[PDB]
Amino acid sequence: PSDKPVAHVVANPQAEGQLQWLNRRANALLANGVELRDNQLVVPSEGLYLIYSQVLFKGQGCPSTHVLLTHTISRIAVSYQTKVNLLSAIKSPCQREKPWYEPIYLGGVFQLEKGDRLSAEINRPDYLDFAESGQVYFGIIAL
Template sequence: AKAAIHLEGSYDNTQPTAQLEWKNGQGQAFAQGGFRLVNNQIIIPQTGLYFVYSQASFRVSCNDGDEEGAGKRLTPLSHRIWRYSDSIGSRASLMSAVRSACQNTAQEDNYGVGQGWYNAIYLGAVFQLKGGD
């Protein structure tokens, strides 16, 4: 089998110190060919080229009736993939994206009051990674 890993994340925003937790073996998540998930980090099985991808899906309410509704259209949402390697000695950003969470017009906001809007950020590229990264 080819080396591959696909994880699903869960996030509990009711916890004050919540962070994304990666899940393996649940839903569509799996790991094969030497990939491991250790302490919420993927361990690369061997040096080579890897297609790294991530999708962050989110739902936001862009208009809740307060006076700052227009400012919410400018709320940034960032999405970043980090790499840690002993050869580097620290973590480094592999790829990132930033977008405004609310991108709809005032008319669309009125249509979607109370429902929120669904959107996603997708990142994907090929990288040379080392075994153990």
């Protein structure tokens, strides 16, 4: 077996106007020290980690406004109070004004320390999509 800290949390299809992460679901886990505290993954030990996250946005008809969709994975060091962007993307789904779909996939390898908190956050949770399993997730893998 592997003693490697790993985590794969999935979005709750019933957290009104927010992106709430869960481990107590099928095909989602927290293992070898990784904790999910206040919607954030707590790094159990210093090392290199693969951080990833995907969100799927969907909008029934192109809204009557230019819409900005952001997805950001942040790092809050043990002492820090707020985010420090690790990976971030911003997409404009609506050029003009049929349902649109926009997935955002962030991933990279980062050096993390003992007790750092990682958060995957979006600006528009009103456009999230949970109509199918495995479309919205956040995870980490120690190398």
